[model samples]
Structures are given as C-alpha cells and as structure tokens.
Target: VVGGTEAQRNSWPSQISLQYRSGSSWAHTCGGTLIRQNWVMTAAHCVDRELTFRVVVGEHNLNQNNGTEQYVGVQKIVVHPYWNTDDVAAGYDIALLRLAQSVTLNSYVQLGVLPRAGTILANNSPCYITGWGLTRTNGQLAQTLQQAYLPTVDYAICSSSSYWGSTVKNSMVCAGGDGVRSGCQGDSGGPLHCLVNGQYAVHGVTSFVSRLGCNVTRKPTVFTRVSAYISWINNVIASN
Candidate 1:
C-alpha cells in the first residue's frame, strides 16, 4: 500500500497471503480473506495465471517466518461466472478458493465476517486496507503487512467525471483517492475492512487501482463489493 504503516501482528486475523510457486520457492502474489475454514475470498485476477497456488493463514511477514503461519494447498478455484479478464472496469472481479483441508482458527487466524447483501457504506465511512503489496508505485513489496486508513468514497462521488467516472460501479467500492495512501500492486485480492455498527466487516475485495500509478488523485482504489455477492458466495459454498 502507498503511504501505509506496518500492521500489528494479529490485528487483522482474517488477512492471508496468497502465494504462487516460483522456481523453487513460493512468492506472495496477492492477499485474501479467510471466509471459511477451507474457503478464501480474493480477486479473480489473482488466479488468472496458470500456476500452483497456496494460501497462508496468520501470515504477517513474507520474507521471515512469524511462527504463526499455516500454509494450505488450493484444491479448487471458483471464479465468478460473469468475470471478464478484459473487462475489470465492468466489475465481477471476485473469486473463491477452496483449500485442500480446513484450517484451524485461532487469535492469529480467523474467518472474516461479510457485510449483509445490498449493504452500502455511507460516504467517507471508516475503513482500512491491509496487504503485503508494494509500499509505493513500482516499489518492492514490504517485509511485513501494511495497512492504510482508506475512507469509503460513495458511488456517486467515485463515479463522477473528475473521479473514476464510468469506471466505478455500484457493484464496486472506492476508497482512498487522496493520492497519498492507497492499495498498490500485489495488494489485489486483499480485504477492505469497513467499520459499521461498531464492528468491522469485510466489505470489499481489492480489485484495481489507477493504471497511471498506484496512488492517483481522483482515482481511488476500486474493490469488488463483497456485499453485492453475498448470495452468490453462499451458493458457491453450499454447492462446492
């Protein structure tokens, strides 16, 4: 994330590291949220490549072992049927991955709660974006997880001509267009935890940011609105 601070261990228990097998070692590619014991919610774009993937729960640092990590193989991947790789701006960029085995829950590893269907946050709602993504545009990934306070930019403001314009949709959530703090490369598929009713819930799946740069003015980070797919997620879990 651009202009973020190192996150405290166990602060965001639902955050996970989605990695892909490199030549001999696994590399962090994206971030995800542990939605169920064996299910993870991430961006469809994160798994678009044909590579072996794994989910690491309770992961805080990428380069060092924190002694709280639980690695699991990905057994099945279920991308949103309507997701179009070439049409990310059109929304439907979410995906779900089923693990080979269920992971145990603890203080450092737990399921993320999703917002209710059709739920929408008010303008400038309090939220945070956490991930192991690059700390700046074209910069190296952070050694530890980073988090930025990203307030929700309501659809109306985000879809305005000066903002994201038509690129923003109701099915998406926009936050942190301030050009100071925002999600960057490798942050995709992470969670946008929003505080509502005195509790934090996973309301977004980090999807995209301005192509011009990681942090751009009037181009807030866009995310797949999790609340919009509550029914779809439930159906997938039930059938899979």
Candidate 2:
C-alpha cells in the first residue's frame, strides 16, 4: 500500500499470503483472507495464470520467518463463473481456494468474518486495506505487511461521471482515492476490512486499481464486494 505503515503482528489474523512457485523458491503474488479452515477468499485474477499456488497463514514478514506461519497447498480453485478478466471493471473478480488440509487457528491465524449478504457501507465509512504490496507505484514489495486507512466511497459517488463513471459497479466497493494511500500490484486479493456495528468484517476483496497509477485522484481502489457473493461463496464451499 502506498503511504502506509507496517502492520502489527496478529492485528489482522485472517490476512494471508498467496504465493506461486518461482523456480526454486516461492514468490508472494497476492493476499488472501482465510474464510474457513481450508478455504481462502481472493481475487479470481490472482489465479488466472494457472500456476501452482500455496497459502501461507499468520505470515508477517515475507523474507523472514515469523514462527507463526502455516503453509498449505491449494487443492482446488473455484473462480466465479461470471468473472471476466477482460472486463474487470464489470466486477465479479472473486475466487475461492480450498486447501489440501485444514489449518489450525491461533492468535496469529483465524477465520475472517464476512459481511452479510447485500450489506453496504455508508459513504466515507471507516476501513483499512492491508497487504504486502508495493509502498509506491512500480516499486518493490514490502518486507512486512502494510495497512492504509481507505474510507469507503459509496456506489452512487463512485459511479458518478467525475469519479469512475460507468466503470464502477454495485458488485464492487470503492475506497482510497485520496491520491496518497492505496493498493498496488501485489495487494490484489487482499482484505478491505471495514468497521461495522462496532466490529470489523471483511467487506471487500482487493481487485483492481486505476491504470493511471496506484494512488490516483478520484480513482479509488476497486474491490469485489464480498457481501454481494455471500450465497455464491456458501454454495461453493458446500458443494466443494
């Protein structure tokens, strides 16, 4: 995240590192939320490459071991049927990955609470975006996880002509268009945790940022609204 600070360990227990095999070592590709013991919620675009992937829970620093990490192989991937890579702006960028084995929950690892179906946050609602993404546009990945406050921009405002216009959809959430702090390349599939009813819930799955830049004005980071797909997620988990 641009203009963000290092996140506290165990602060966001559900945050996980989604990695892909890169030659002899694994490289972090995107972030994910541990929705269940063996299921992770992420963006469909993160797995579009068809590469071997793994999920790392309780991870803090990518370069150094934190002693709380749990690595698991991805057994199955379920991308939303309506997801269109060519039309990311059209929404439906969510995906679910089932782990080969269930991961143990602890202080540093736990399931992320998702918002109820059809739940929508008010404009400028308090939220935070966390990930191991770049600290700047076209920069290197952060050594540790970072978080930035990204207030929600309601659908009506985000879809207006002066903002994202027709690009923003109701199935997505818009936040952090302040031109200071926002999500970047490696932050895709991360969590957009928003405070609601005195508790925090995973409301969004980081999907895309403005093509102009990571932290462009009036171009907030777009996310797949998790509440919009609650039923779909439940069905995928039940059938798989």
Candidate 3:
C-alpha cells in the first residue's frame, strides 16, 4: 500500500498471504481474508492466471518464516458468477477459495468478521487497508505487511466527476483519496476493515485503483462491498 507503515503481526489476524508458485518458490501475489477456518475471501481477478495457489494464514512478513503461518492448499475456487475479467468496472470481482483443510484458530489466525448485509458506512468512516501490496506506484512489494488509515469516501461524493465518477457504484465502496496512503498493486483481494460501534469488521474486498496511478488525487481505492454479497457468500458455502 502506498504511504503505509509496517503492520504489527498480531494487528490483523484474518489477513492472509495468497501466493502462487513462481519457478521453484512461491511468491505473494495478493492478500486475502480468512472468513472461515477453511474458506478465504479474495478477488476474482487474482486467479485470472491458472497457477498453483496457496493460502498462508498468520502471515506477517513475506520473506521471513513466521512459525505461526499455516500453509494450506486451495481445494476449490468460486469466483462471482457475474465477474468479467475484461470489465472490472462492472463490479462483482469477489471470490471464495475453499481450503483443503481447516486451520486451527490462534492469536495470529482467526476468522474475519464481516459486516451485516446492506450495511453502509457514512462518509469519512474510519477504516484501514492492509496488505503486502507495493509501497508506491511501480514500486516493489513490502517484505512485511503494511497498513494505511483509509477513511471511507461515500458513494455520493466518490461518484462525482472529479473522483471515480460512475465507475464507483453503490455496490462498491471507495476510500482514501488523499493522493497519499492508498491500496496499490498486489493489495487487491485484501480486506478493508472498518471500525463500527466497538468492533472492526471486514466490509470491503479490495477491488481496483485508478489506472492513472496507485495514489491519485480524487481517485480513491475502490472495493467490492462485502455487505452487498452476504447471501452470495453463504450460498456458495452451503452448496459446496
């Protein structure tokens, strides 16, 4: 994430490192959220390429071994039926990956709490975007997980001509247009944790950033609104 700071290993337990085989070693491609012991929430675009993928929970640093990490194979994947690779602006970029086995919950590994269906945060709501994405535009990925305080930019304003315009839909949430700290490449498929009442919940699935740059004025990071897909997620889990 651009203009982010190193995140504490224990800060976001549900955060995961989604990797793919790169020659002889696995490389972190995107971030995900452990919604269930054996289920992960990511972006459909993350799996655009057919490569061997794995999910690593309790992951804080990418280059170093964190003894708490639980490396598990992906058993099955179900990308949103309406998701179209050629047009991400149409939305529906979420996906669910079933793990081969259930992981044991611990201090460093836990389920991500999702927001209630249809719940929408008001303008400037407090939230944070965490991931192993690049630290800047055309920059290298961070060895450690990084997080940035990204306040929610409500639809009304985010859809304005100066911002994301019509590309920002009601089914999505936009955050962080400060032209500073924002989600970048490799951050897609991650979580946008928003503090509501007294708890933080996974309210967004990191979706897209401005094509202009990772951090552009009035072009905030857009996310697939998790609240809009509660039933879809439940149906996929139940049928499979």
Candidate 4:
C-alpha cells in the first residue's frame, strides 16, 4: 500500500501470505484470502505457473515467526478459464489455490467471509485494502501487514476517460485513486474488505493498479469483483 498503516493484530485474520520457494527459504509474493480451510482466493497474475507455492495463515510479520502461523503446501491451483496473462485489463484475474491439508481455524486463522453474489458497493463506500505490498511505487514489501482506507470508486466514474477509462469494467471494483492511498506491488491477490451491515466481507481480489505508478492520480486500484464469480468458485470447489 502506498500510504497505509500497520494493520492491528488479528484485525484481518483471514489474510494469508502466498509465498514461493526462494533457494533455501520461502519469500512472500502476494497476499490471499483463506476462503475455506483448504482453499485460498487470489489473483491469477500472482501465480507463477511453475513455482512451488505454500501459504501461511495467521501470518502478520513476513520476516518473523508469528507462532500463530500455519504453513501448508499448495496442492493445486485453478486460474479462471478465461484468464489471459497478457490481457489482464480485460478482467478474469481471479484464481484459487487448494491447500495440501486443511488448517485449523481459530481467532488468528479463519475463513474470509465473501460478499453475496451480485453485490456492488455504492460510490465512495467505506472499504479497506489489506496486504504486505510495497509501501511505495518503487519500494520493497513491508515487513508487516498494512492496510489503507480505499473508498470504492463506482464503475461509472472509474471508467471515465481520466480514470481507469474503459479498462475498468463493471465486473471489477475500483478503489483509491487519490494518488496517495492505493494498493502497490506485492499487494496483488490480497483482499479488499468492505463494511456492509456492520460486517466486513471480502468483496475484491486485488488485480491491478495503474501501470504509470502505484499511486497515480485518477488511477484507482482495480480488483476482480468476487461477487461476480460466486458460481465459478462454488463449481471449482465442488469438483476439485
């Protein structure tokens, strides 16, 4: 996040670190949401096809042992059928990772509640982008999890010529284009939690930001709207 604060401990328990083997150690690459004991939701672009991956639930610090963490190997990955690596702007940037084993749930490790199908937030709705993404456009990833208040930018405005333009589709959610607070590199595949009816729900899977910069004016962070793929998600889990 460009301008963010350290997230409070256990504030977003469903958050997970998506890491890949880097020589003798694993390195955090993206953030994902634990949608079930064995399934994780993330952006398709975050998955480097041949890389061996693992997930860390209940992880707050990237460089330190949280003790509360539960590490699990990724048994399988399913990127959306229509996902195109070179055409991320066309959407379909969602993916799911099946864990090798079901992790135990607790206060620090829990499933992320998703928004109801077809749900859409009103303009400027209160929401937050959470992840361990870089703190600046050209910065390294943060040592701890961070969150920024990124209000929703309705499709009508986000798709305007000055905003994301036609790249912002109705199937996606846009937030935080103030050139100050926005999701940056390493934050892709993280959660965009929106407060609805006094409850926080995972409504977005961080997809892309302006190519110009992480915190560019009128270039809000774009996300794959989870509500639009409810059926696809259910189908994948049912058969896999």
Candidate 5:
C-alpha cells in the first residue's frame, strides 16, 4: 500500500520513515512518531520479532530520502507489559522503542505534547492522520507521505449498539468513516495528531480498522490513546 496524496502528507506534524534489516537485505519500511529523543511510539504488532531499525525524520518524499536518519539498534522493545491481544483493556496494542542514540530536536523533528484531562475534541473535530499506507483498500502502500482529515465520533453515538457494538473500549477512541478515507494496513505504525496549544501532538497510534469497506458508517477506527499511557511513558523515560 502506498501513502496517500500530496494533500494528505501536508496534514502530519511530524513524519518518520523507518527501515529494518531482513536477513541479508535492508528494506524501506513503515513509519512512527518521535515522542522523545530516544523513544518512539508504534503499534505493538509492528515490532513483529524484529530489533534493528532506522528512523528518518523531517521529510515527506521517500525519493528525496535526505533526512538525518538515525541508525538505532533496539536496546529494548517494551510492549505494554500488561497488553493482552485478546483483551482490549490490557492495552496490548501499544509498544515503545528505545533508540541506541538520541535524535537532535528541530522544527521538523521534535517532541509532541499530550492532551489534558476532560479536553474533548470530538466528532467532526478535524484531527489529521498521515502515513505511507494504501490510499485504497487492497492497493499498494505509497512511498511518499500522505494525509487525511478524520473527525472524532461522539462517545454516545460511537458506543451505542447501533455502532461498534460493545467492542469499542474506553481506552480507545474512534475516527474516520466506512473506509472512504482511513488508514489501512501500511498505516499501522503511523501517528494520529491532534492540535493543542497551537501545536500538534501525537495523540494516537493506528490500532484497529474494520475489514469492511470505507462505507460501513457504523465502523470507526480505533487508536491507542497516548494520554492514557502517559504515566507509563514517563516511567519508561525515567528508567531509560
């Protein structure tokens, strides 16, 4: 799956290009957000039994490929220690990677902020999502960056039986529509940014999406709520 269009790429606050070694070869891979100089937030499944990866920051075009990419050998792969794939509440879908070296902060590449308590930016809330995932379902992932505007769903409507049934957890939040414009497979490790304090913060990581097409109005995308993991993140930072 390729990343979305030019307009989509413009929606992200920070874009990270990653690569990993596979056997005797290295391949351009997925992306994630740099939340700390030495840490990045990504989907738990993205680690997928691998350890060595490089993160390239501050660029949208995969062809240019001229960012200050860091070669980070994973010092540790810390999945949410309590996450249980079968249990949504276990918070099993989030993972943090500690880089071998720290990245220098700059305008294009910098740490993001967190949302505060009771800070609701729901339904039609104009959150932006970007990635190199497939622009269309069953299509190829793009090499460059792409973005899209997604609106948050009202909890009451999102939680009602008329919608996601009872599977949508409180730890998760929803965005997007049927599949008209949503992050698909390749988008897994990407970030969901929300504007706060006149700046955007990496608020969520792509977690789950419906298998059904984009028109399934009731099915909303689910993301790992970053704020909920703030304490965990703080402790991880402290330990590191």
Candidate 6:
C-alpha cells in the first residue's frame, strides 16, 4: 500500500516551500518540511547567500500563492559539520534552515518523529516521498504537489555495482527505484516519510544521485539520515 492517504499526503510537515529571488523576480526554490515551529529541514545545496530566499509553511500550491510565506532568513546554513563531499562515503549531506520568526501554530504543519538507527526499511517500509520536483530530467517542476510510493532499499542491493556501488553511507537511507519512479530536480530539499506508532516521521531528507538522470532501475535515491542529526537539531531549536 502507499505510505499515506491523499489527506496525509497533503499533510502539514510536507507543506513547506522554498522561496528565493531570481534576478528581479521572486520564485519558488524547492520543497521542505517543517520539523518544528521555528525550524525547517532542507537540503544543504539549497543554501545561498541571498536574503531574498524565504520559506512558506502550510501550503501546497506555489502558483496559487495562497500560503503565508514567512521571511525566515538563514541565521545560519550548516551543512553536515563533518561532511566531506570528495569522499562520498564519509560525507553526510544535510542542512538546517533557521527562520527569523517562529511559525504560527496550525493544523497543517507540525513536527514529525525520527526513525531508529540501523532500522532496515525495505520493500514493506510503507513510506512516501513528495515534492514539486520534475517528473523527468530537464522538465519543469510541477506547480501542483507530486508524490510517490517508495519502498526502502536493501543495503546489499543498493550498494552493489549494479546499483550505487557502496557509495551509500550510514548517515543515509534509500528509497524509490534507481530512477524508474523517484524524485528529481526541484525535489532536493523534500522529506522522506515513514510511519511509526501511527505517526509519520521524517526519516530522510532527499539528497543526491549517483546517476546522471532518473532512469537507473536498481539505483536507490539517497537521503540524509534524520536520526543522526537529532541532537544538533534539538540544540538549534532550543537556542532559537
């Protein structure tokens, strides 16, 4: 079965949007999750020096432009403190975006739990990934919310040469097919959710790709392991 219902698919944590200025015009950057009232989880690569970029919560449509877009400036943009991009195995690609103001309480956006470490989330994982990302490479991002049922990948299979070749790290998790039905451009900062104890937890943050495009059948999509950053995340949220 799919991870969530159409209603859960349209739930709060998944409602975050990335907003950035393009030249003279403002535009949508990517999708994100509201893990806390004052904090949002996004991809590290999405961070730029521009203050024009903001985050919107409790809304799905960027075109409708109906949600409250909060100007949460990046007080700090921290990539995995220990990440080393050159050594793919050693790097943990992740980032945290801090908002200038605390988000207002609403039913649409709320915090999600974290999955346990070493938890094997294979075929029956009952998970989903959503984004405004392109369905295909070079395609325009969907103005409407798009989502897919994703199953956890077996590590042995995901790391084989036929797949990602062991580049997968402990600080990561896999989902979707190599590229058959997975996230693409515009999905960089979205979340990978898993159901536990009847609550949907943000297990991963969409990260990188080993393939040039989304068509490699056995390759698994990489995500930032959410559990590893818990302490740092808690610290950030507390400090704010």
- What tens digits encode model 3's per-residue C-alpha lDDT throughout 159-239? 999998888899999999899989999999999999999899999999999888999989999999999999999999999
- Clash pairs of candidate 2? none
TM-score of 5: 0.85
Each candidate: what lDDT? Answer: 0.96, 0.96, 0.95, 0.95, 0.68, 0.68
Return the TM-score for each candidate structure. 0.99, 0.99, 0.99, 0.99, 0.85, 0.85
Tens-digit lDDT track for model 2 on 113-193?
Answer: 999899999999999999999889999999999999999999999999878999999999999899999999999999999
Alpha carbon lDDT of residue 86, candidate 5? 66
Please give, for residues 1-240, the per-residue lDDT of candidate 5 as tens digits.
Answer: 222356433345356765677789555566677777788777776776555776766656666554544455556677888777666534457878887788776666766566664355666666767777766767766766777777777667777897776776666667776446677776776787777668777777777777764325677666777767778877877887
- Residue 210 local lDDT, model 2: 84
Consecutive 10-residue window with the lowest summed lDDT within model 4: 44-53
What lDDT is reached at residue 235 by model 6?
Answer: 77
Give the lowest summed-lDDT range of ten residues in model 6.
1-10
Off by over 4 Å in 2: none
lDDT of 4 by residue, 99-175 (tens): 99999999899899999999999999999999999999989999999999999999999999999788889999999
**Which of the two, 3 or 6, has more TM-score?**
3
Residue pairs clashing, model 4: none
Q: Which stretches of candidate 5 lie above 4 Å from their native place?
A: 1-4, 7-13, 86-90, 213-216
lDDT of 1 by residue, 144-167 (tens): 999999999999999999998899
**Of the candidates numbered 1 and 6, which has the greater TM-score value?**
1
